């Protein structure tokens, strides 16, 4: 492939460099339209800018935490982090979020990696070996109320059991209801006067639920869960302007008030170098 062809002096009536940008086109002008060039080859394919590659590496999408401790006398397991949950979503952590929102609709399978590490902040004789269990919990299946409810039987709901310190990995097909996931949605769930705006009404995928299977030892053990997400089989439509201001909320486009100028001011003139 040639990156530049050889081109010499020109004295024409045919001027490729004068255009009318009002038309909305970006005319494909090249170095050889306005200087004299020599042949050179590309030596490159643009492999690593493919959208599959761009969205295809694992990104941290969520960090939560649960603890193993005596539940005796706990009136609210959920509240003691005896177990916990995640209202699933991807736009919670921003690094990956800015990348996805370069597109309007996106379609992909997900591969998830879950790393779990334990901490024992206060005096323990040892490090126990805990098994985590972490059940998907669809929009419409009982949310588990205690850390050892019938829910955890998970007879119809996929669940994975792995050890703290290890990693769990599995992959879920594209579960969207439509043909693509909306990265943006300028609509409502119905025409009510006070319903929520955005995608949070679309992006309704149920939540994920972690717990330790082990009963309690004499000390307490903090287990912190990190969920990583990798898109595989990516398809993206309609590019948009990149995010400039900071994010404030999952699912709304809102930016913070009295934010700071995002364009760097010159130290000098327009004329400055």
């Amino acid at each position: 492939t040639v990156a530049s062809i050889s081109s010499g002096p020109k004295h024409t009536q045919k001027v490729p460099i004068l255009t009318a940008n009002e038309t909305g086109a970006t005319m494909p002008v090249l170095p050889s339209d306005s200087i004299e060039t020599r042949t050179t080859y590309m030596h490159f394919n643009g492999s690593e800018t493919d959208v599959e590659c761009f969205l295809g590496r694992a990104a941290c999408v969520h960090v939560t935490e649960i603890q193993n401790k005596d539940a005796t006398g706990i009136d609210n397991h959920r509240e003691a982090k005896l177990f916990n949950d995640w209202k699933i979503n991807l736009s919670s952590l921003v690094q990956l979020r800015k990348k996805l929102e370069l597109f309007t609709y996106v379609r992909f399978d997900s591969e998830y990696t879950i790393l779990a590490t334990a901490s024992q902040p206060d005096s323990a004789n040892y490090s126990s070996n805990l098994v985590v269990q972490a059940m998907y919990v669809p929009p419409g299946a009982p949310n588990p109320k205690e850390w050892d409810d019938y829910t955890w039987q998970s007879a119809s709901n996929p669940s994975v059991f792995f050890k703290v310190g290890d990693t769990s990995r599995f992959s879920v097909p594209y579960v969207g209801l439509a043909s693509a996931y909306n990265c943006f949605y300028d609509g409502y769930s119905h025409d009510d006067a006070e319903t929520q705006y955005g995608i949070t009404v679309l992006n309704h995928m149920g939540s994920m639920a972690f717990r330790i299977v082990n009963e309690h030892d004499e000390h307490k053990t903090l287990v912190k869960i990190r969920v990583y997400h990798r898109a595989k089989h990516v398809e993206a439509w309609i590019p948009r302007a990149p995010r400039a201001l900071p994010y404030t909320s999952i699912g709304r486009t809102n930016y913070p008030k009295n934010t700071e100028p995002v364009i760097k001011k010159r130290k000098g003139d327009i004329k400055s170098y």
Partner: protein, 40 residues
């Protein structure tokens, strides 16, 4: 070799090697030729 039955479980896809910027760079209704005048 796929070891698994479902398609979601296969590895990453392989390069589009599609590449056609004209839907974005030249969505004009009447075709513009480089070198010919923009507005006639």
């Amino acid at each position: 070799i796929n070891y698994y039955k479902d398609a979601a479980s296969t590895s990453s896809a392989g390069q589009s090697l599609s590449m056609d910027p004209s839907k974005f760079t030249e969505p004009v209704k009447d075709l513009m030729l480089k070198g010919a005048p923009a507005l006639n």
